[PDB]
């Protein structure tokens, strides 16, 4: 299967079947975060998906082709995390991103907390475009989680 | 071999979506290992 959409990333190596993350299929390419697969090949039914591009520092990887997602947060509008938690149905969560300010510019961030296996869930704009992936973030003085909106280059 | 993917949905904006979370502005650094950290 290669239909566009959001997919769970599963492994049967540990106990039971375990969800290690999430990703996006678009234009024949599968997009997830590097720390989900560590760059390993992936099975899709009886087919195989081989890595094509990745970068540990961006924490991103693509399979079967180059990174295809190029929408970006507009800096103003609310977005939706399409969270896909282990063992739970996909749910849209709407939020106004905050901002990670770095030495190399500002990136959107979403202050929503989910299980680790939710890594790679897409963040969307009101047009349905994927503006980045959820799950590379920080923990604040509160103890709560804030994820960058991590987007690649097309 | 080890990992496999399973479809979980369309990627679509939901009209009636739950709205939540705040909008913090945070100084962070990104190290060569791809880990974000809070800057002093």
């Amino acid at each position: 299967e290669t239909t566009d959409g959001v997919y769970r990333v599963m492994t049967r190596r540990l106990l039971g079947s375990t969800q290690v993350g999430v990703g996006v299929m678009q234009e024949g390419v599968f997009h997830t975060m590097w720390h989900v697969t560590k760059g390993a090949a992936l099975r899709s039914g009886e087919g195989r998906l081989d890595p094509y591009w990745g970068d540990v520092k961006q924490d991103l990887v693509s399979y079967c082709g180059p990174w295809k997602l190029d929408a970006a947060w507009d800096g103003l509008s609310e977005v939706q995390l399409l969270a896909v938690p282990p063992g739970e149905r996909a749910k849209n969560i709407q939020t106004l991103p905050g901002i990670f300010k770095t030495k190399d510019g500002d990136i959107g961030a979403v202050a929503l907390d989910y299980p680790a296996g939710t890594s790679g869930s897409p963040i969307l704009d009101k047009c349905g475009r994927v503006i980045g992936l959820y799950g590379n973030g920080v923990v604040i003085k509160n103890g709560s989680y804030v994820s960058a909106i991590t987007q690649g280059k097309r | 071999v080890d990992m496999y993917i399973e479809r979980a949905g369309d990627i679509t904006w939901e009209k009636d979506a739950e709205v939540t979370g705040n909008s913090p502005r945070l100084d962070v650094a990104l190290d060569e290992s791809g880990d974000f950290s809070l800057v002093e």
Binding site: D113, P115, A116, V138, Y145, S147 | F36
Partner: peptide
């Protein structure tokens, strides 16, 4: 973030 940042 489950403990962590990921």
């Amino acid at each position: 973030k489950g403990x962590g940042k990921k």
